Structure formats: structure tokens, C-alpha cells
Amino acid sequence: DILLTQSPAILSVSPGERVSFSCRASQSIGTDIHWYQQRTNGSPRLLIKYASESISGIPSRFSGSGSGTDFTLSINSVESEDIANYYCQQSNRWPFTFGSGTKLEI
Amino acid sequence: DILLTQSPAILSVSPGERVSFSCRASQSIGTDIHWYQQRTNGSPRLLIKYASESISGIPSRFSGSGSGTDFTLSINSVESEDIANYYCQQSNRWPFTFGSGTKLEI
Amino acid sequence: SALHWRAAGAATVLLVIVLLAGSYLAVLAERGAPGAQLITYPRALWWSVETATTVGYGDLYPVTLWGRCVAVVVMVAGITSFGLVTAALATWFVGREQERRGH
Amino acid sequence: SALHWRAAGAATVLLVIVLLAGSYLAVLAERGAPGAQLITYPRALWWSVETATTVGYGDLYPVTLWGRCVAVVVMVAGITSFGLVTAALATWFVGREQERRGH
Amino acid sequence: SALHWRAAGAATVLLVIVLLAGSYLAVLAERGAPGAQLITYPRALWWSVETATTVGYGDLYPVTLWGRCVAVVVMVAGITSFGLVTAALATWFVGREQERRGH
Amino acid sequence: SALHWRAAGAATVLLVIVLLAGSYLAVLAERGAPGAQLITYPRALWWSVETATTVGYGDLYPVTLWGRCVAVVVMVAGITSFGLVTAALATWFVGREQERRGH
Ligand SMILES: CCCC[N+](CCCC)(CCCC)CCCC
Ligand SMILES: [K+]
Ligand SMILES: [K+]
Ligand SMILES: [K+]
Numbered sequence A, B: 001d002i003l004l005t006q007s008p009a010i011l012s013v014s015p016g017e018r019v020s021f022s023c024r025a026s027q028s029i030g031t032d033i034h035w036y037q038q039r040t041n042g043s044p045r046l047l048i049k050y051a052s053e054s055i056s057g058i059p060s061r062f063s064g065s066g067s068g069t070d071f072t073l074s075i076n077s078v079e080s081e082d083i084a085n086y087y088c089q090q091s092n093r094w095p096f097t098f099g100s101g102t103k104l105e106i
Numbered sequence C, D, E, F: 001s002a003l004h005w006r007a008a009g010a011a012t013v014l015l016v017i018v019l020l021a022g023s024y025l026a027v028l029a030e031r032g033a034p035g036a037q038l039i040t041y042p043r044a045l046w047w048s049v050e051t052a053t054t055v056g057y058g059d060l061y062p063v064t065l066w067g068r069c070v071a072v073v074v075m076v077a078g079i080t081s082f083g084l085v086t087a088a089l090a091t092w093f094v095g096r097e098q099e100r101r102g103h
């Protein structure tokens, strides 16, 4: 089973600044990585698919890059509404797995 | 995306001596590595292609070796005109990437 | 119409059906097998196309017994078919040859 | 019955025999070779099926001289056979064409 | 001249065209896909040759949908063609056999 | 004797020659290319057999331009040949069919 390491656990940043959360795979998973955002007491919300493909309804502020073992979710100018938990999840190999998660902090 | 580590950043050497800059890939890229020389305020100048193939107009002093993850650019008897920045760049996998660069110092 | 043409004709449609059900069943067979990669319809379909055409780069392959079974069927349908087009292409030539031979 | 049909017919049975003895001998040839993976009957059999059908994903392959020899034989039987079905499929078409040509 | 020969004849030229446009389009389709390797014309061309001839070592392969599409076309042209040479080679034999049969 | 049989006959001998010179030239082409593995006659020969028979597990493959060229030739000879046996096998059937048809 694949391991999705997400460190740091928390990330401090100031308004409008650019933030980037890191997610590492225990082995090449290509581009089969997807991002989810979860706000306090919310349900997860698909943010990005296949590491760099955008989803409709998601701020153009949200972007992603990476391939193989090192992937990056990026917010280009943070802001209050962005405060949440961010998780990565691979579907390269069965069974799917989730990242330990990373908390945004403005 | 591939990582091209180039260390040290600087390299001290004495006239005529033989120098060798190291460039490491985050994963096998075969021979798909190429060298560029950039002098103060110049444009890059292809030095070597595919790690060991020479380019016309380039001093026979310039050579290269390596394959997989560890590549070496070598100057057989340095000299003033050689003072510059040296970068490696792979084209094994999209998107191309560049090495952090290494400064020669006589 | 000309049998050998209906054949090649059929042969193609049928293959397309095997390719699809192949992709579908493959995913079904593979999911559940740790380290398995043949697990999403889209690639599973490209898996089947490279397999029928017998290329198969090894980028993807079944690791379960049922997954493989599907592989064997996709493989066999893939082969058989193209070979049928060939066969049919031969009847065509052999026939038009006679004609040029005034018979 | 129609030769070309007995052929394809035979051809199949024979292959199934080669596939089996192939799997069996392959394991026998490979065991003993450090780093070898073609070493348990079950997969060895799927190894032979992907090999006869000429696909071969490279998930498994012989590294010993005798192992390879078996590979060459499985490969050759695999090819030859299917090609025989093709050939036979062609006789079928060429013949039924004449009929439609009133000859 | 003999149709089956013009065919095999054509068949070859055409393939060479597919091989080339294949290499060209493949690079175009792949570039942009992280981790993609099918990204420089030269190897892309050897990629197409190993693919048409259905070998494909897995040293290189498309990972994009359009890249694959090109693959399917190269694969299919590759197969079809050689099979056409075969077919044509058969007309040749079948015909020269009649002659030796005094007919 | 029967042309199509001399053909298949020839076809085989010739292949064996291509397989050998292939192995020999491949090693010659590859040595000198860093990271190359197609560099000792023995395996180079098994490389050629898996390649002619179009299987090719990707355990070994050329990375030089001349190495590949040899690959393309081995590939093509491999294909062509077997297809010739097929073709020849078809003449055989088509002919013995006529006989059973009392013609
Ligand atoms: C020596 C060629 C052997 C491979 N063939 C022919 C490919 C011609 C590019 C693959 C057919 C494609 C379904 C025949 C199947 C043999 C089992
Ligand atoms: K094949
Ligand atoms: K193959
Ligand atoms: K392979």
C-alpha cells in the first residue's frame, strides 16, 4: 500500500501570500494524485484531479504540480476562506490511500 | 519533475589544473543530460549534448561523462576564459529542468 | 455481400465489444489486489487495446487470475481478428488474380 | 473432415500441451538462478500464455539458457498455431468465394 | 501490374508515412504530460517502429489520450500492413502452385 | 519441390542467419553507449530471438541508432518469415481442399 506523507502538518502564512503544501509518495504514482479541501465540520471537496487538472467551481487561485513521488498543491494568494485541512490521495495502485493531512493557518 | 542537483556551488582551481563539476539526477535519465556555460552577462552556450557528445566550436578541453543519475562535466586544464557558471539540463522527461548551477573560480 | 468481407466486418465490431467488456471486467477483477494498477476504466481500456494488438508495453498488466483470464481472451480475440482481416485480404487477392488470368 | 479444420483443431490441442509442459519446464529451468522470478507453476503458466500470444509484458521472463529455450519453443508454437488458424480461415473464404462465383 | 504486389507495395509506402506522422504527432501529444518520455522526435520514431512491428519494449510509451490514439493507429497500420504482405505472399504461392499443377 | 515449401524452407535458414548477424552487430553497435545492456553476444542472441518473434520483454533493448536499425531488421525478418510460413501453410490447405472437392 502506498504512503502519502504530508509535511508539515501545519503551515502559517499571511494574507494574499502564496502558499504551497507538499505531498510525497512512497513510490512513483505518476500523476494519479488528487487534492481535497476540508473545512471545519465540512465534507471533503475535490480541489484538483490528476495533480494538475482543475475542477469546475474551484477558485483559479488553486493550482497543482508534480509527478512521480513529489507533488505540490498551491494557493496563489491565500485568504480566510482558505482555512482548512488539505489532503492528497493516490489512485495509482489499489487500494487508494490518503495523506495524513495539512492544516492551513493565516 | 526531475531534480538536477549541482554541488558544490563554487569550485576553486589553479591554472592548467583539471576540474570536474558534478550534476545528479533525482532518477535515471540515461544520457539525456546537456551542458551549458554562461559567462558574466552572457547568454547560455551549449557546451556538451547528451552528456558526452561534443559540439563544434567548443574547446577539445571540454568533455563529459556519466549515465543514469550521476554526470560529470570536465575541463582538462582550466584557464581564465573558463570563468563562468555551469548548468546541466535534462530532457529525458517532460518538462525539461535545469541544474542549480556551479561557479568556476581560478 | 462477400462473406470474407462480412467476416472482417463482423470481426471488427465484435473486437470492439471484447475491448470494452474487457476493460470493464479487468477493472473488476484487479481491484482488491494490492499493488494492482489495472484499476480504472480509462487506462484499462488502453490496456486492452495494446493487449489485443499484442503490443503490451508492460506499463499495465493483470495480476489476478480472473484479470489474466480476461487478458487471454482479449489477446486471443485481438489476434484472431486481425488474422481474419489478413485471411480476408488474401481471398480478395487470390480472386482478383484469377480474373487478371482470364478465368 | 476438412483438413484445414483438423489442422486448426489439432493446432489448438497441441498448443495447450506446449503451454503446460512449457510452464512446467520453465519453473524447472529457472529455479536455481538467483534473482529469477519465473519460479512457481501458476504464474509460469500465465507467463507462457502471454508469451505464446506474443504479448509478454516483461512482468516475467526466463533468464536461464534452458528457460529461454523453452521460451523460444513456446513463442514459436504460439505464433505458428494462430497463423495456422489464419491460414485455415483463408481456405474457408477462398472456397466459399468460388461457390458464390458459381464454380 | 499484379494487384497483390501493388498492394504490398502501397502498403509499405503508406506505413512509412504513418510511422513518420506518428512520431511527429506523438511528440506533440506527449509534451505537456509530466513524467512523459515520448518527447523528442528521434526516439519517438523508434518508438513508432517498435510499435508498428508490435514489439514495443516498454522503453517508451504514450501516456496521454491523444498520444495513445496515435499509438492505436500506428499499431493498426503496422499490423494490417505486414498481414497484407503475408496475404499477398499467399496469392503468389497459391498461383504458382496451380501452374505446377498444369492448370 | 513445391515453391511455397522451398520458401518457408529458405525463410527459416535465412532467419537463422539474420538472428546471428543480428546478435553480432547489436553488440558491436551498443558497446560504447553508457548504460547500454545489449553488450555480450550470448544475451544479444536471446535478445534477437525474442525480438524476431516480436515478443521482446524489455529485459534488453538497443539504445543506439545502429543498434535500433539492426532491431528493425531483425523485427522485420522475424515478422515476414513466420508470415511466409503462414502463407505457405495456406497454399497447402487451399490446394488439398480442391482435391477433396474432386477438382
Ligand atoms: C512475428 C510476428 C508475430 C506477431 N503478430 C504479427 C504482427 C505484425 C506486426 C501479432 C499480430 C497482431 C495481433 C502475429 C501473432 C502471433 C502469435
Ligand atoms: K507481438
Ligand atoms: K509484444
Ligand atoms: K514489455
Ligand SMILES: [K+]
Pocket (backbone or CB within 6 Å): C055, C056, C057, C058, D055, D056, D057, D058, E055, E056, E057, E058, F055, F056, F057, F058
Ligand atoms: K512487449
